[model samples]
Target: SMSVKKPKRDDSKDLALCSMILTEMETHEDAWPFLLPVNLKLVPGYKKVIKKPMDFSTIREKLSSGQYPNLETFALDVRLVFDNCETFNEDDSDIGRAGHNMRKYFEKKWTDTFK
Candidate 1:
């Protein structure tokens, strides 16, 4: 069986949704709540056995459960995810863009926080 090709355009909300997750980095203290209750219903998706796909809820659980320290720490955890991520569509189809935007969000947020 062949999968119908997804539209070759960036329409997924992964960036927007990721943005909200990164937003929590704004306040490092008492920031666990920010990572809590994240939603992924908006981002475009592909059907497969996703393995440890980048997500806020898991990170939130880590934070809420005293597993992770803050959102910045979580950012470090995603470097490998972004490195292995891909953009299947020529137009990116919003897949790779999500990781790209997520990087920018954390970089800018972390930069402004210190300097």
Candidate 2:
């Protein structure tokens, strides 16, 4: 028998964009979407957890606090989230189309700090 599988969900590159935008960016220092939310399908009950996605506010706060290091690190953290999004589903499918375009917008705009 043959089997097919799908990996789903998660970006971004934009602030030139508005806040109300349907497609926005997020990060996973804690690494969401690896099935953490479900917490049921473990064979050996995996241990040693990682931090969940870091939202925009957290990024701002860390930078503002003047203690956490590396602005570029945050930038990449945010990118990691959207990067996952770019591949979550097959391009142009019904359910996938929504996330696909959303990721597209976010990734395109992540560096739209200007223009």
Candidate 3:
């Protein structure tokens, strides 16, 4: 039988992609605010406003543990971190600007990697 192109699927490819993006985000200069969860002591109102406090470290934990079912799911968590940043911060603030830059970088990388 002549072999034609086969359907390709990757169980770990998405995982690898997530890993790369996570690493890139971690190393990014603007990633400081997102590297860890917001300090509750400093910002007590944080938990009250943002019910789901997502951060790069948390995302890393989930990725390592294979909690993300697909790239889409992983992407959401990544986006959440930025979205939360925007919600709690002013657009002109230092950390807020960083969040925007970091988010843009992630979106660019995601498009470049998957599209």
lDDT winner between candidates 1 and 2? 1
| Candidate 1 residue-wise lDDT, 1-115, digit = tens | 2897866754354344444554564344423322332233643452242344544555545555656444446666555344435422232646456556555666675566433
* TM-scores vs. true structure, each candidate: 0.44, 0.34, 0.88
Minimal lDDT window, size 10, model 3: 5-14
The local distance difference test score of each candidate is 0.47, 0.41, 0.89
- What's the best-to-worst order under lDDT? 3, 1, 2
Task: Specify the highest-lDDT model's number.
Answer: 3
lDDT of 1: 0.47
User: Between candidates 1 and 2, which one is better according to TM-score?
Assistant: 1
lDDT of 2 at 2: 54
Off by over 4 Å in 3: 1-11
